[PDB]
């Protein structure tokens, strides 16, 4: 029997391999679920100092 | 530094076992990581417990 | 004032932990695994919280 075993880690760092996911544009200054390479989460957006 | 599809392994007949243990395969398509590793061999069957 | 603030703080600190789950942040259960063990362990997390 052939074996192979797949051990990725996750979420610690500047992440690589993902997605046949297509990004969408870009918004800002509303209440928006979003999605930053598995960071999902839930707010608004604004520029940053 | 690819992108991976997973579901053309998951969705093939070819494999006996295919067992995930800290994600499950309908949502590997939608995660970042970091890298992955995949290790290669082969043994008896009586041994995959 | 110096205790009730210092109480204050623990309690929000209480919010990273594991209680012996894999994450203390639901969102990466939720969006890593499917439902039948989700369960399992955001059991985990809502009983440390109580």
Same mark, same amino acid.
Request: glycine share 6%; proline share 3%; aromatic share 8%.
């Given at each position: 029997?052939?074996?192979?075993? %797949?051990?990725?880690? #996750? %979420?610690?760092?500047?992440?690589?391999?993902? @997605?046949?996911?297509?990004? +969408?544009? #870009?918004?800002?200054?509303?209440?928006?679920?979003?999605?930053?390479? @598995? %960071? +999902? @989460? +839930? @707010?608004? %957006?604004?520029?940053?100092? | 530094?690819?992108?991976?599809?997973?579901?053309?392994?998951?969705?093939?007949?070819?494999?006996?076992?295919?067992?995930?243990?800290?994600?499950?395969?309908?949502?590997?398509?939608?995660?970042?990581?970091?890298?992955?590793?995949?290790?290669?061999?082969?043994? &008896?069957?009586?041994?995959? &417990? | 004032?110096?205790?009730?603030?210092?109480? /204050?703080?623990?309690?929000?600190?209480? /919010?990273?932990?594991?209680?012996?789950?894999?994450?203390?942040?639901?969102?990466?259960?939720?969006?890593? /695994?499917?439902?039948?063990?989700?369960?399992?362990?955001?059991?985990?997390?809502?009983?440390?919280?109580?």
């Amino acid at each position: 029997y052939r074996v192979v075993v %797949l051990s990725f880690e #996750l %979420l610690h760092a500047p992440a690589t391999v993902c @997605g046949p996911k297509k990004s +969408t544009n #870009l918004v800002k200054n509303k209440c928006v679920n979003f999605n930053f390479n @598995g %960071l +999902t @989460g +839930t @707010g608004v %957006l604004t520029e940053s100092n | 530094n690819c992108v991976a599809d997973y579901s053309v392994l998951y969705n093939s007949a070819s494999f006996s076992t295919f067992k995930c243990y800290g994600v499950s395969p309908t949502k590997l398509n939608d995660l970042c990581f970091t890298n992955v590793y995949a290790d290669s061999f082969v043994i &008896r069957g009586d041994e995959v &417990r | 004032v110096n205790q009730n603030a210092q109480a /204050l703080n623990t309690l929000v600190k209480q /919010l990273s932990s594991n209680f012996g789950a894999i994450s203390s942040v639901l969102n990466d259960i939720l969006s890593r /695994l499917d439902p039948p063990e989700a369960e399992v362990q955001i059991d985990r997390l809502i009983t440390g919280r109580l």
